[PDB]
């Protein structure tokens, strides 16, 4: 129910290895800057 | 003042030997081979580096036991499952996998360290009188016994 020992800096960052976001899937707008793929401009 | 020579990968020269197991006792051959693999026969022995030689053991199927070891010596292994204790006799192991028999016997006489595993990887055992390492030109080696 509770941590028996505190988590070291090393273990914490090891666990955060995969905690990240990825670059959006984006494409240049041929006529109308960049946009999400399969989305309309909605602002151009 | 400190003057003791220390071998390193730049000056170590590892050779190849072939050892015939036919007519030899299992552990008596095994201990000498373990000595050879660990470099204990070299004047430049250095405990933290691998100074040993490569050993090829042929005719593993002709290794000999004394007493009633063929039927009374049992090899146990556990699979880490609740009842997973398995066994095989030394005689059945010699019949079905003499290379494993000799390899295990020798590796049991090496340290379980990282260096020990590396040094045990320099052993090649074959059940018959032929080996595939003619390119390394091994020299015949005679056991002191």
């Amino acid at each position: 129910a509770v941590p028996k020992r505190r988590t070291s800096k090393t273990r914490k960052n090891k666990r955060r290895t995969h905690f990240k976001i990825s670059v959006p899937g984006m494409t240049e707008c041929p006529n109308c800057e960049y946009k999400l793929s399969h989305r309309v401009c909605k602002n151009c | 003042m400190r003057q003791t020579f220390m071998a390193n990968e730049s000056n170590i020269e590892r050779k190849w030997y072939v050892i015939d197991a036919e007519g030899q006792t299992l552990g008596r051959l095994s201990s000498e081979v373990a000595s050879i693999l660990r470099g204990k026969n070299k004047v430049t022995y250095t405990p933290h580096v691998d100074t040993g030689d490569y050993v090829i053991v042929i005719n593993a199927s002709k290794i000999e036991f004394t007493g009633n070891k063929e039927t009374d010596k049992v090899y146990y292994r556990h699979s880490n499952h609740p009842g997973g204790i398995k066994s095989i006799t030394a005689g059945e192991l010699r019949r079905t996998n003499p290379e494993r028999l000799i390899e295990n016997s020798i590796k049991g006489m090496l340290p379980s360290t990282r260096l020990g595993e590396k040094q045990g990887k320099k052993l090649f055992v074959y059940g018959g009188a032929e080996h595939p390492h003619a390119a390394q030109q091994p020299e015949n080696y005679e056991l002191r016994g």
Binding site: F19, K20, P24, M26, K35 | -
Partner: protein, 111 residues
Amino acid sequence: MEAKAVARTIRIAPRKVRLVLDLIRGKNAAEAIAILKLTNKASSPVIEKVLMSALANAEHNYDMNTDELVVKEAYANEGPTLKRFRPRAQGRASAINKRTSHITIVVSDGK
């Protein structure tokens, strides 16, 4: 040269800001702008404003190229923490840290 902008005491926890910052570090300015525009995180418009400010500094104060700029540095430091409390059961109060960030962006032409 190098141009810089800093947004201090942004009321977003640095852990969350750094996630977005990791995307644009080392990228070209236009690519970073597109990434920030299309990234769905609360930090994105704050970071976008810091980057625009850095690019404006470049152009106006140092007459830099404005099209050959890369995000040389991008980091978030910890600002002062607003200490708050949430009532819990049995008359007990639990701490809430409303953390802040200092956000820095450095652009450069590489010369």
